[PDB]
Amino acid sequence: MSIHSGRIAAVHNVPLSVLIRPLPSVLDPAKVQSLVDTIREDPDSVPPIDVLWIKGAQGGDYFYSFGGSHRYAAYQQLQRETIPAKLVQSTLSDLRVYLGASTPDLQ
Numbered sequence: 503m504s505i506h507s508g509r510i511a512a513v514h515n516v517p518l519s520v521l522i523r524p525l526p527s528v529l530d531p532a533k534v535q536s537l538v539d540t541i542r543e544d545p546d547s548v549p550p551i552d553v554l555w556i557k558g559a560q561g562g563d564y565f566y567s568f569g570g571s572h573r574y575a576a577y578q579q580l581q582r583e584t585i586p587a588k589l590v591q592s593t594l595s596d597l598r599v600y601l602g603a604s605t606p607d608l609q
């Protein structure tokens with residue numbers, strides 16, 4: 503009778519450089535290193551990080567990253583070009599939950 507409907511999410515290898523990280527990270531250096539070790543020997547055991555995928559007023563794609571901080575840090579320390587990310591389609595109102603009056607008028 504019924505179906506489940508929701509926002510589109512898709513896992514991709516996303517260049518680290520395109521992830522916008524507005525806020526500072528709180529990091530346990532031990533956990534970053536444990537993650538670096540895991541990524542090196544068993545990357546499949548490290549899930550994709552969740553990323554807001556926002557399309558702006560004129561169709562620009564923007565990728566906002568808030569969580570996944572330890573994984574993000576670990577991929578940076580490995581000088582990786584990309585990171586596995588679950589791109590979750592999100593609206594500017596979704597973004598405003600994080601950014602409030604600082605939310606950009608994305609184009």
Ligand SMILES: Nc1ncnc2c1ncn2[C@@H]1O[C@H](COP(=O)(O)OP(=O)(O)OP(=O)(O)O)[C@@H](O)[C@H]1O
Nearest residue numbers: 528533536537540547548549569570571572573574
């Ligand atoms: N060696 C490891 N150390 C920590 N987490 C690991 C490790 N290997 C795999 N994982 C997995 O990676 C994910 C890490 O998520 P977690 O929420 O702990 O940190 P984060 O999201 O990267 O950073 P934060 O939550 O601080 O923003 C979890 O799914 C965990 O099971």
Ligand SMILES: [Mg+2]
Nearest residue numbers: 569570571572
């Ligand atoms: Mg987390």
